[PDB]
Amino acid sequence: NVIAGIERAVQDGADVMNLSLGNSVNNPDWATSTALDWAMSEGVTAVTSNGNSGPNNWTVGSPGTSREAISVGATQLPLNKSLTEQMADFSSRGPVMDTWMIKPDVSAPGVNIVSTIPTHDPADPYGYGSKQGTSMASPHVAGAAAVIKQAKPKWSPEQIKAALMNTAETLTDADGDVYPHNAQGAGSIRIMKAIKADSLVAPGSYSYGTFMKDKGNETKKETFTIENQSSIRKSYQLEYSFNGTGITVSGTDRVVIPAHQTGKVNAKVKVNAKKVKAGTYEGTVTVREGGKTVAKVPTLLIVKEPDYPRVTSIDVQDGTTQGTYQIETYLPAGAEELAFLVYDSNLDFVGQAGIYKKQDKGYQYFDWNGKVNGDTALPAGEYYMLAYAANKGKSSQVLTEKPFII
Amino acid sequence: MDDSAPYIGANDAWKLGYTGKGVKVAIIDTGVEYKHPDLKKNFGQYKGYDFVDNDYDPEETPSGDPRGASTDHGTHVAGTVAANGTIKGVAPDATLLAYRVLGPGGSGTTENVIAGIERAVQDGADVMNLSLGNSVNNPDWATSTALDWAMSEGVTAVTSNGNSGPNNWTVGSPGTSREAISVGATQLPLNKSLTEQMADFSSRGPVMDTWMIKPDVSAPGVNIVSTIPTHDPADPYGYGSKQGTSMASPHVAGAAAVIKQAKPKWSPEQIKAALMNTAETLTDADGDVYPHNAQGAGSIRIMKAIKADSLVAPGSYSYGTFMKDKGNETKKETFTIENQSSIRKSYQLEYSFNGTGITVSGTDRVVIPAHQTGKVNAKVKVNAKKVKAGTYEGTVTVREGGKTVAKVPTLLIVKEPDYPRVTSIDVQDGTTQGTYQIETYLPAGAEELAFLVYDSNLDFVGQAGIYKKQDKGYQYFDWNGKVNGDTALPAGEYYMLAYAANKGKSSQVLTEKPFII
Amino acid sequence: MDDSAPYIGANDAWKLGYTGKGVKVAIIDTGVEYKHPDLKKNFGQYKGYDFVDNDYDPEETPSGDPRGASTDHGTHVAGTVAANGTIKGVAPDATLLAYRVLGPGGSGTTENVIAGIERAVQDGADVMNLSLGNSVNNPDWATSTALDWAMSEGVTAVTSNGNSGPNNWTVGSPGTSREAISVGATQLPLNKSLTEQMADFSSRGPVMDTWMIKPDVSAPGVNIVSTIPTHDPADPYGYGSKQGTSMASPHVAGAAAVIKQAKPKWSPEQIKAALMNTAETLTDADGDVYPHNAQGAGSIRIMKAIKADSLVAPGSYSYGTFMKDKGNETKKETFTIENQSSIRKSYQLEYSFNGTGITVSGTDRVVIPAHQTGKVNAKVKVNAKKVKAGTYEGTVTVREGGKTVAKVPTLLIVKEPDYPRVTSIDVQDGTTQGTYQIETYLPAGAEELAFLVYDSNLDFVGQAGIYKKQDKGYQYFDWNGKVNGDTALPAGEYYMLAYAANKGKSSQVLTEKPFII
């Protein structure tokens, strides 16, 4: 139904599309993400929510993992020790699995938003209500995209995404530290700055992927594109930075672009495997032009294996045969070892449901005969199951909410 | 038949209503006893044909036949495919046709098998089962050409891989066909409890001259109980347990019948790709994945195959041989993904190869609209300076929205393949008394060929003959019975060893059934 | 008759004044009770002829006739065509003529039907209705030749397609004529509410040896209420509901009468082209268009046919068979568009065919002056290397200034058509006591023909006879009652199965009404 809705919205000539739905599978190639990438190529800007998950990396939702779509996180407006803008602690956080893309793309006000609702009361069916969620940060960006498209009728959907993402205010938390890139994206939108922008840097954010070399130096490079929308030949100045030691960044320090033309800047990153601690490092490419800053491109690279949750979700349902069960789990990148353990209603370790090795990534299904540690039948009651997955030198676990009944 | 069918997923398909109703399965074997109570209602009015006798009564060979011995292979195969009653076949609603092409003793002319295949295509059979086969690793045998003629006249063809010990390049003749599902045999998980394991009598690929991966799929084929004729007038019908690669194929034939009932629009190649795509890889006792030319793609899973909206074809690909002495050689293949669903999907490709000096690349992602087709260009590159000669197995894995939709087994060979240089040798009496004829089969010719003679105690008596630059195929040599030149053998019983050397490797084969001087 | 006539558009034509006045319709059936109050005033002074009795009283067969059973088919057909009163026929102003050619029991000699057709042409009948027919798919049957003789002596001929289950190549003998409107039966939209649907007893084409698309048109023929004789002296006239393809044709006969009143200058072929051109395609329950040899061109629409200034002829075309093993084969047809209007028009052609390897082209646009005729050259090309054998359905669509003026169903067959190799078999007692005669019908001969015998329990007793290289048509074989050669049957009741194999396909047919040994 969501794919049909997206396609029918493309049919009906919609210029901007808003998706405040989404599941919690960190997969860039979900069906809803492929459909969203089909648009944004049929000239339709697509704005989607990042998802509603607590402060935790690798929790971005399925439609909000699409490669070409503006994913929006939620922020709190400056409230009185007076605080500045702050990201809400329920916005899903990137990166995206299997592409390591920085998400959310942009953040917008999404906490305590009052707007029109139906009261579902025949006496007075219309009213106003205050709702909160990442699903209500995206409508701000959808309205911003509509305004920009009215202002700049020739911009492509990717140009609008680059203009929103380029002119965005970085957010600092209470202590005074800049929020991580996979909590902010590029900052809060500023419609006025985006509307008055004669230079576009694309892609608005880039991810260098992973560096897996055990020894030696590994070099990667990216080509950013600067479009000089003005009528005057300009000179753009590039400053590359990365946090963390052992990462050296270089590239084109200056370009000159004629009027109504396009230039290419070759950013280059080099990681010394002998000096760099494994982890996720955030960099930035800053583009300056005649005073003002025209863009601040968030970059990101990962060293060794990313620290994604090895197992994301687990649920237990009744099997086709009475007395047996089916365990469905999601492994983002497979599992060298997978274990299902059973806990009583008091969360006391009853025993070990199952052991498995060398599991393929994606959705995995296992039949469980309801017997623990082998040949030991459970007493009747209410139980929880814990999935423990170990892969590539890290292990994760997830507990079944909504306990199943024996 | 009460444990293998649950394993492959037959019962689960039955509860979905898919039992093979309306599908017609032909059994080209020694004939079928179409009066077993478990087989009575699956046979229509016209039961089939009997080519070894030229009558419309395809009954099995009775007991006490001058030309040979009584047979029960065909009835067992038919019960495995579709038996309704005490024993339930894989597709216990399919119509059956019997074609007696193998005479008494289980031996049949190639012309009879070709006639049986063509007549089964005539009679509208949708699925065809061949549990016969010789042991010539030739993809262009007559029975293989006939099997490739079908699978193009809309008839799925399932054949056994053959019954030869654990050894590469031993796949049989009909099971070497380019377009036919060849089935290997597996052992069901038995209690240190073991998982599924391939039997050690299944023939193993690759196919000669095409280097194709065979078997195509494996299926349970060890200790299969099914309907047999007892050849006893007191009670002519019973049940018996037989084992062999010839009894793994009926499971896949029943699976194909069930799928054809479930998916009535699929072509024979689409069914082959669906069985081959959704198959569970098998690991041996220690924990190592069985080689591709011992497994094909794993054991069938009828339930996964029935519920499949994406088909990757061909289900397995072979890049052939890389013969360059120096430099880098690049080959490429185009796999085809059919998106049978109603929603535009994105497929993700992972290419891997074992062995060093082999670099694999290609299209890492495709987007296919609904009810359409996309192409992925896999590419392999071999550095001749770094790669040790041998056979290397790779894999193309296709993922779509979570689940894995296919795991395509790929294979390439570096330098010359290590096939047996000589396959079979036999010695018969010549047209002239006192002389002999030696008939041997050389899969790719022989730079040098030598026939040596051994006594009954396997002591080297001497050297029968030497030959050079022999053409491939069947070779015949006249031997005057004299050893080392002009030395006549003493009377007795002798064995002959053929030693063939070709392209830097040598092989030998000994004549069983010793000949008499 | 109160729901089908509104559906086909009879009432709308009536309000335009077109009710069939002056048109004469002949009903060649079991006779008509020309005293039903609904039929009394539609019969002129001379009611018709009675060929089974040779008198001028074409009354239906009375109750209690030694030669057979009482009949009511003809009266029902006549009420459907033109009944004025409580039930209103399609053309409730047409004169009627009754021709009793089918004797008691509904069976009649072919010579009587030919005589009835010729006498109906004598008597000046403008429309002719044949709701009879055997089940021989032969376009050159005597009744079909007689029907093609009319439609050239200015007499429109409407016939039933026949009553055979959903199966291709089952169209009856008079309904295989090259020039006659053959009608299939449809179910009216009934409440998941369904649209119009073809009944599953209508015979389906194509015609043998001409591959013509049949039925030509479909019409409501399920649950039709109309005038019947009750065969009760207390009240001899009543109404009854009958179903069958034989009752779809009267709707088209009434439609032809109405059109002939509306367009007095149209030839019988022009009326056929006008009915066939303006017809609504029917989709089944799932949503797929019914095949052309199940629909013809769709259901009639009298109102659209009456208001039509452009006629495309022939209304449907068949390209025959493409037998080339390799290469490309091209065929072409010339359709004719008659511009009956007073204004020069431009017609636009769209050609389509289902299936791959078939490329269709031709004249994409013609301009025809007023009251003139243009020719469009449709052309089909089949690539033998890419096309799977089978029957493919195409369409030529003609558009003119907005509205669509025609949708010509086309059809071609690749390689050998999949007709039943053997159609009918019966066994009668021979001239010599103890022997039998087997009469079978082979539509195109048989490379091999086998007669097999089954007991009353349908258990294969043995093989009656084997024959090779049989000529097409009716074949007769003497059988000595002995099975498998020299083995005499035990006394009892037996069935016989004819298995015919020809040109790479085999068919079988079982004798109903078992014969007695």
Author numbering:
A (entry chain A): 269 to 348, 477 to 802
B (entry chain B), C (entry chain M): 158 to 348, 477 to 802
Can you provide the manuscript's text about this entry?
In this study, we extracted extracellular fibrils from lab-cultured Bacillus amyloiquefaciens, a Gram-positive bacterium with great potential in biotechnological applications such as plant growth promotion, biocontrol, and commercial enzyme production. In this study, we use cryo-EM to identify protein fibrils surrounding lab-cultured Bacillus amyloiquefaciens and discover an unreported fibril species in addition to the flagellar fibrils. In summary, our study identified two protein fibrils outside Bacillus bacteria: the extensively studied flagella and the previously undiscovered Vpr fibrils.
The amino acid sequence from the ModelAngelo model was then used to search for proteins with similar sequences, and Bacillus amyloiquefaciens Vpr, a extracellular S8 family serine peptidase, was the top hit (sequence identity 77%). Vpr proteins fold into four domains: a catalytic domain containing the typical catalytic triad of serine protease, an insert domain visible only in the cryo-EM map with a low threshold, and two assembly domains mainly responsible for inter-subunit interactions. Vpr proteins assemble into fibrils with a helical symmetry and a C2 symmetry. The fibrils are held together by two sets of inter-subunit interactions, one between subunit n and n+1 and the other between subunit n and n-2′ (the C2 symmetry counterpart of n-2). These inter-subunit interactions are predominantly hydrophilic, including hydrogen bonds and salt bridges, but there are also hydrophobic interactions. The relative position of the catalytic triad (Asp186, His230, and Ser531) suggests that the active site of Vpr protein is well folded and may be in a functional conformation. The active site in each subunit of Vpr fibrils is located in a cleft on the surface of the fibrils and is accessible to the solvent. These observations suggest that Vpr may maintain its peptidase activity when assembled into fibrils. There is an inner tunnel of ~23 Å in width at the center of Vpr fibrils, and extra densities are found inside the tunnel. The shape of the extra densities is a straight tube with an approximately circular cross-section, and the diameter of the circular cross-section is ~15 Å. These extra densities may suggest binding of unknown ligands, which should be negatively charged, as multiple lysine residues surround these densities (blue arrows).
